[model samples]
Target: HHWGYGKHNGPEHWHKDFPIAKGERQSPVDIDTHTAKYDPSLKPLSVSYDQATSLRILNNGHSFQVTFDDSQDKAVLKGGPLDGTYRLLQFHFHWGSLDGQGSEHTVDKKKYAAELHLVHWNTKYGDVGKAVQQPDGLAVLGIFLKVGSAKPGLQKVVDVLDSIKTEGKSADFTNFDPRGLLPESLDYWTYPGSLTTPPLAECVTWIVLKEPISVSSEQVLKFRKLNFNGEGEPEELMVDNWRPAQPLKNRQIKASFK
Candidate 1:
């Protein structure tokens, strides 16, 4: 069945039922880029999205996330934190409202303005969905975003936001490639984790990028214009859609520049 927690019952309260729901590694916290160090050799791999696997865009009404069933597309990891070829499964985002903050991961107890998750899987074993059990079964690329200049880069994805501005208004998209959304840098931090959703299998390999993608306050406003139960009828607007931070559980977080 469908389940969700309102403001009072949000993360702090709901995470009790679902352990994975409370992820300490939750991302999207405001990061001070100037202070963070960067490696001269750090770089991101170029990804190409062809036809073998078509990108499917869903309105889902409450939120937007284009799922790339690894059974379909070929996601070759050229460089970055990943060194081998991996297939893409899907990717989604988490956000907040004008007055409130939105973020998945917490930094030193602080959260970012928003977060984006690019979920992928190492294809050496098989498809992304099937690789869930292996240590390297899943690779989730994360990026942070702040209220700044409108992101012309995200114009393509936000363009469709109005189409599914309500719940259950999902539609199918063709010839849409996600590789274009990736930032120019490949510098990243990785660790072991779970799905961050239900089942919380604890099978995910987290890769958080040090850099963030810039998006205009207007673009972010566009995302904030979504509804959980469709247009109107009174359901608290789906404002900040982040899953809530999880526990480190003795898990070591590692950064790779080597």
Candidate 2:
């Protein structure tokens, strides 16, 4: 019945119920009210485009993930805020357990409809496998997906949504720029953070854009249509897959300008 974490209904509550919560870093960080620093040396994405590009879908009868292989070809920046040549790795999403709200990042504590994460690694670390070890070898470009009018930027991915509607289901996506989904404003918020999932390593240089991309309610509805359970098994459906917002400690969030 709430939007975030606290000693009562917030992360504070979960932190008490869970022990590792204390070790979790890069969470609950407040947004930068100012602006972010930009460098022209940063290269734009120049990877090969493909629709239905090869995909690896995992259901596990619970949550799901979609991975792309060719995304590595996309251009990455060297010695940037993350202090490394970051390469596009994989992208995924976070949603609510239901629909009203379940995203991890929030604006003034208000939950967005959905959130997308494009995970990347620093080339200095030699491939994603080795990068996860460094304290700041990873950068995640986070995009907020809102429910509203039809967005041309999302047209490329609309087709793939229907293919993995069941739990444990996966598919291949192609011909998508991934970058096309970015908002017009390159302005962003950055901070030292960790992966939303376990190991929960604090190795991320988070770049969350200020401008949010819009997707029609139908586009969001399509995700809701996925089968919580694959084929026939029954447990809990996966209509919602969001992680609640974490608590911000003494962490400083910096903003970047276009």
Candidate 3:
């Protein structure tokens, strides 16, 4: 069955093909800060990304993703409740057609304009395909994006929206460092979760940043110009690609700061 964010094939329908849709350790949960306990032992995240590793950007019909060359450790994430480092694979975004309704994991039930997912895989498992099947195989960094002053660096990504407006479209996108898009503070919350999309694998060690990055309203609208349909297909703007918040069953979120 096809999986999408529409009424017919959305998250609610995912359970039909993937029974783990709402199973234990599901992600994009509502983060009630009051319930989070400060974990002083959690170390600050360490990142060393080489711009040369960036390969290309594509519209996967779900979200726009920038894939990286992970043959080496040129771009990897260490620390922040992680184990044996995770090689950068790709980064993508989920957003709403309008502001105030996009972010997947909400804080106190408040959603941001958009959400960013920087995906990585544990080197211990050798390759990403095998890694994703293990419980500790992946580490995903999540950052909320609020619409405010224009983020100068964001223009690079927004500028290319017109080039790949249709599904299955891709273009060479190199020399871009994902590090530039991070917020000032690295404080974050930690949890064991699953991929928000299909396969819904519960193999992610989620590190969600408490601080949000800023982007201009115009920059976000540019993302909406993207189409879920390939050329010649019925027009369907790519919006609301995020999954609804899932249950926080048998789990607790840990904060890196007091």
Candidate 4:
């Protein structure tokens, strides 16, 4: 019995196995804009990526992820609540079993169709495993996905879903720029929170963008087609792979723009 997004093994029951689930700085919190502090001190985020570094994509039974080679700082994030450059590890998305209510972090209590997470590790930590334990070791950029126009960037990812539909399966996903997935405004909400998944370490400095990117309904449904079980295992649809918003205890959320 490992951790997953099932009824028996979902987020609510995670603390039974991993005690850190009850940590004060847990993630995916509902952001109430009226309560968010506007911090002018926060600098604009700087994102620099080398398209050549995007190596492959995989279906990890939990969610689909686009992994990058972090051997060097080819694709990295800087400024905006960060002390040093954070290197890209991989990026993944969380969605619902259906459309309309899948995103982890919500704005004004309203949920989006899905949410994208660009996971990074602080260079000072040397590795993701070590970074996850310290307060400033991880930085996750969250982008909401709303139903609307067909996003060409997202379509490229959608086209490969069938190639890696089974858990543990993977395929080459090359020359993709993660920057194209971001919205125009760098305005975001910043907070200290834990991973939304198991071994929920309170190590992430979350940078949630205020603007949402577009993805057509048909493209989003493609994610629901993937299986949570590996090849030859009993078929289980991979959807709603998201943690519900947690309590905002002893934390202050800051706004990059007024």
Candidate 1's displacement at residue 222, Å, is 0.6
Query: Global CA lDDT of candidate 1, please?
Result: 0.64
- lDDT agreement of model 4 with the native: 0.92
lDDT of 1 at 1: 30
Give the lDDT ranking, best first.
Answer: 4, 3, 1, 2
Model 2 alpha-carbon miss at residue 233, Å: 0.8
lDDT of 3 by residue, 1-258 (tens): 478889899989999999998689999999999999999999989977754378899998889999999998888899989879799999999999889899999999999999999999999999999998999999999999999989787788889888888889999998887877889999999999999999999999999999999999899999888998898999999999999899999998999999
| lDDT by residue for model 4 (1-258), tens | 888988888998999999989889998899999999999999999888754288999999899999999989888999999999899999999998766789999999999999999999999999999999899999999999998897877888999999998999999998888877989898999999999988889999999999999998899989889999999999999999999999999999999999
Candidate 1 residues 174-246, lDDT tens each? 5666655666676676666776555455666667776667788778888887777766567657777676665
Per-model lDDT? 0.64, 0.61, 0.91, 0.92
Tens digit of per-residue lDDT, candidate 2, span 76-102 = 533335564566666776666444585
Poorly placed runs, candidate 4 (over 4 Å): none
**Candidates 2 and 4, the one with greater TM-score:** 4
Which candidate model has the greater lDDT, 2 or 4?
4
Q: Name model 1 segments beyond 4 Å from true.
A: 13-54, 78-84, 108-110, 231-233
User: Which stretches of candidate 2 lie above 4 Å from their native place?
Assistant: 1-20, 28-64, 70-80, 97-100
In candidate 3, how many clashes are counted? 0
| Candidate 4 least-lDDT 10 residues | 46-55
